Design a protein around this nucleic acid. Structure first.
Ligand SMILES: [Zn+2]
Lengths: 112, 194, 131, 154, 170
RNA sequence: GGGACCGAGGACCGCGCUCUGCAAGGAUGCUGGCGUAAUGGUCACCAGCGACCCGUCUUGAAACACGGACCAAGGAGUCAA
RNA sequence: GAGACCGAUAGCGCACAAGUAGAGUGAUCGAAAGAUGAAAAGCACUUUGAAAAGAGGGUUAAAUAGCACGUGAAAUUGUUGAAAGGGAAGCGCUUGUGACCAGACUUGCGCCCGGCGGAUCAUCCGGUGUUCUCACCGGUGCACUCCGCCGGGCUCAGGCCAG
């Protein structure tokens, strides 16, 4: 697909990074820590960090964490958004490497 | 006849009256300093009255009603712009609500206080929401949720999931996708494949 | 500092509902309280070990009547115009969105209450957060 | 939060239903409890032996003092009878679910009856009332466990 | 201040509760050996230095004898023992320095990535270790002269069978 | 001297005193802890104490007599002069 | 033609096969019974097997709306899970244990320094409406003043439970 390769050069390039590094975080002031850690165990080389430390802590944005994790060396950032204390949305962000900007963001719905 | 007007509003009926079970009554009139249905803060019963309101351009105005023009509700209130400087704006109330009831002087300053802090509170949470970029959106409607719950049930049956996994895994072993001497399988099983 | 005003401690004299006599045994009798009227009824004469009757001595303190545990009084809100009535009373009252308010109108109410500093009891019913 | 025990996958399962069956509800409930959690081939032999008056069905909940035979030593219950029509309706329902499993491609020799359930059908309006029943049942393959690889250090 | 009072929140009345100095019990003297009953150093025998304000007591081990550093403790959570040690040669200026209230009191990449991690145990400061040594130097030299006090202060208090604290003289 | 329970009120106003402020018309000060859980609710079960038939209708007595298998809906001081 | 009437145990006995079905020798007595869906699109075809029944599959926004049909209460019943018990237990007060559920203050204002930008600033110009001295636009600018925003620095106030 030529239209897909031009529109998204980073996903459809020649060779991906060999060992992807994945960061999983939760919804802001989330309570689904056990559900997000199991999603982190789904993907190899993934670590879980809570979005907010305390209830009255700094409110980091997804845009910020994407910049923070790209500096550290992660490949993708996953945010599991909760509803009724259950995982309801999966936001997949592609941080990439070197100079190309953080690529496409694919949001999903976790139903059952 | 301000006392007679209060007797009709309080005891019989007012279109701006909101009654709650929590013990306090509320006034829905937009020209009320405090949204309460007491005598001292009724725009209707009080022929002379003052209030503070905010225009959507951000300007705070002082509305003064006098009795001498009460027969024409079109020319009823007079709009007087308040300063952005807070201590200067408090002085305009003291100058212009001179010789007024102390309640109306007091509640106009407090309404001025609340409107100024809301603007500061507005600009703070607008800056924070522009930082996070998160927005509240409606959830899925009941009929659409019923549709995706029904069509997921049919997709799950039509997938035949553990059969498809078995079918695809046996396809790769046949096609040599696992390579020679695989760590996937049992060597007495590959000799069956030839 | 965004919280309720300084209120004296809320003391509830009794946290348990007064249940109708023999409502646990017969399904036709609802648990809603009915005063017994038989002259030999052991609840009515108030022997010990039986159900107590409601009385005016159980009445809550007039300063803390109708107050939520946070210190607020609930205010039923149907649209954005009702929240603005709480502009001067954002420390005494809390916005309770009515049950028959649509999804979109709730977000307009929830946005308005945040700007006015008014607590919402039910701020996550028909809404969700999108990044 | 809590998560309920999820259902075993439908393609590993097999369902059968019987509605408005002209058969006694108290008898069928006692017959279905006798074979709950058995093998498929174990149940088809038992229900055929009940037809041929060989093995008896114990009566536990809706128990009537009718017979006291030595066949109740294998159940521990002293009350026993021989439900013939209840065995025949349950045999045809189990054979239906065996045919359903073979249409879905399941191993015929390894179904167990994990779910059997008898409800009540509406009464046949004639002073005398009949008591029909609904029956539903689910078969699944026995749970297959595979070996784990040795974990690799890195 | 800046704002007009936006509600009818009444100010409190002027309260008539003046702060007056705390009068300790007669059994608390500078140099009294004390028995800790609560905290992480419970059961340990320690030596008092100065009586502070509001029931707080400044107390050292000393550190080389039992292991208790310069610390604060509350009067009601300690038991005073009839043995009293000499504080000749102890720097009253250094004790008055460690008796100050300020003494024992005191968004980025690294802030986000250390969310959930257990913080590392920070070590002792140079001044904390140095002030400890300066206070104890004349203290244990005083402790060696009186017989069996060194093993007394290094030991831990405990109750045996038949030890009735309403009859024990401390 | 030791202990327990309690802190109502909310600008000032009074009576006073040991008068640069006080213990004098009602609790402040200092320190700590608190969000993968402070603190509650519901159900199930154990435990200590108490009580263990409702409406009517009599009696010195209900331990009399009448009614009560259960649940839904209906169901009895109304309207005229 | 109407109604401060009733709304399928109501309202005429009958909203529908209603003086019908049914009973009595006869005179006479006399019920129960409304609601798929917007549209039958009222489930083709495969496969069980003797049936007012299933499993696939299809129609439909929805079939947990399938001519047993809008919603679908309680009595009563079955399966699964937790706990208990042996003529116990049930209700009142008070803890404890387990399971599930919830989630505390909504957590902010104020000063100082630098830069940027708008004004209600300028005895600036022009216009509009007015209650005739008050408001609103358009164009000018930053000497003064006041607001914002950004980047630094400082201080204060914060809900609850203990000691
Ligand atoms: Zn009014």
């Amino acid at each position: 697909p030529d239209s897909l390769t031009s529109q998204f050069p980073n996903l459809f390039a020649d060779e991906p990074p060999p060992v992807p590094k994945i960061l999983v975080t939760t919804g802001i002031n989330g309570t689904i820590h056990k559900e997000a850690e199991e999603i982190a165990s789904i993907f190899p080389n993934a670590t879980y960090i809570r979005r907010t430390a305390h209830r009255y802590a700094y409110k980091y944005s997804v845009r910020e964490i994407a910049k923070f994790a790209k500096n550290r060396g992660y490949t993708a950032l996953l945010v599991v958004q909760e509803d009724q204390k259950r995982p309801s949305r999966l936001v997949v962000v592609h941080l990439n490497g070197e100079g190309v900007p953080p690529g496409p963001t694919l949001t999903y719905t976790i139903r059952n | 006849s301000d006392e007679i007007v209060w007797q009709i509003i309080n005891q019989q009926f007012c279109a701006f009256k909101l009654k709650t079970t929590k013990g306090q009554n509320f006034c829905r009139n937009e020209y009320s300093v405090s949204g309460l249905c007491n005598r001292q803060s009724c725009p209707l019963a009080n022929s002379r009255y003052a209030t503070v309101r905010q225009s959507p351009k951000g300007t705070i105005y002082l509305y003064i009603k006098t009795i001498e023009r009460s027969h024409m509700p079109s020319k009823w209130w007079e709009k007087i712009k308040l300063s952005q400087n807070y201590q200067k704006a408090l002085e305009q109330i003291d100058q212009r609500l001179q010789f007024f009831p102390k309640f109306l002087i007091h509640k106009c300053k407090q309404r001025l206080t609340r409107l100024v802090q809301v603007a500061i509170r507005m600009r703070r949470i607008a800056a924070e929401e522009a930082r996070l970029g998160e927005k509240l959106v409606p959830k899925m409607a009941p009929k659409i949720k019923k549709r995706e719950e029904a069509r997921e049930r049919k997709a799950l049956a039509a997938a035949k999931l553990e059969r498809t996994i078995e079918r695809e895994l046996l396809d790769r072993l046949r096609q040599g996708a696992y390579g020679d001497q695989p760590l996937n399988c049992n060597p007495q099983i590959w000799k069956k494949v030839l | 500092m965004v919280a309720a005003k300084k209120h004296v401690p809320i003391v509830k004299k009794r946290t348990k509902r007064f249940m109708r006599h023999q409502s646990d045994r017969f399904k036709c009798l609802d648990s809603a309280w009915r005063k017994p009227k038989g002259i030999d009824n052991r609840v009515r004469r108030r022997f010990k070990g039986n159900l107590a009757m409601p009385s005016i001595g159980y009445g809550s303190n007039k300063k803390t009547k109708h107050m939520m545990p946070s210190g607020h009084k609930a205010f039923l809100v149907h649209n954005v115009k009702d929240v603005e009535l709480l502009l001067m009373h954002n420390r005494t009252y809390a916005a309770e969105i009515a049950h028959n308010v649509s999804s979109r109108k709730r977000i307009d109410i929830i946005t308005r209450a945040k700007q006015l500093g008014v607590k919402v009891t039910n701020a996550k019913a028909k809404v969700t957060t999108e990044v | 939060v809590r998560y309920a025990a999820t259902e075993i996958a439908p393609t590993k399962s097999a369902r059968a239903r019987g509605s408005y069956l002209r058969v006694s509800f108290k008898n069928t409930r006692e017959t279905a409890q006798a074979i709950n959690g058995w093998k498929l081939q174990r149940a088809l032999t038992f229900l055929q032996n009940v037809i041929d008056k060989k093995e008896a069905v114990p009566m536990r909940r809706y128990a009537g003092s009718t017979g006291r035979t030595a066949q109740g030593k294998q159940w521990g219950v002293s009350r026993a009878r021989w439900p013939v029509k209840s065995a025949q309706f349950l045999i045809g329902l189990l054979k239906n679910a065996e045919a359903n499993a073979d249409a879905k491609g399941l191993d015929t020799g390894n179904l167990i009856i994990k779910h059997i359930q008898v409800n009540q059908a509406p009464k046949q309006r004639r002073p005398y009332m009949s008591n029909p029943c609904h029956i539903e049942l689910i078969l699944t393959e026995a749970e297959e466990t595979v070996q784990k690889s040795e974990a690799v250090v890195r | 201040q800046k704002w007009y009072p936006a509600e009818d929140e009444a100010q409190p009345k002027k309260v008539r509760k003046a702060v007056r100095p705390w009068t300790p019990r007669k059994s608390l003297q500078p140099g009294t050996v004390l028995i800790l009953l609560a905290g992480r150093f419970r059961g340990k025998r320690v030596v008092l230095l100065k009586c502070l304000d509001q029931g707080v007591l400044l107390v050292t081990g000393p550190f080389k004898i039992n292991g208790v550093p310069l610390r604060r403790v509350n009067a009601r959570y300690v038991i005073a023992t009839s043995v009293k040690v000499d504080l000749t040669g102890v720097d009253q200026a250094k004790i008055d320095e460690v008796a100050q209230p300020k003494y024992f009191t005191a968004a980025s990449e690294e802030a986000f990535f250390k969310q959930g991690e257990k913080p590392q145990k920070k070590p002792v400061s140079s001044t904390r270790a140095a002030d400890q040594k300066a206070i104890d130097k004349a203290l244990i030299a005083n402790i060696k002269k009186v017989d069996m006090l060194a093993s007394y202060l290094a030991s831990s208090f405990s109750l045996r069978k038949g030890d009735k604290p309403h009859l024990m003289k401390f």
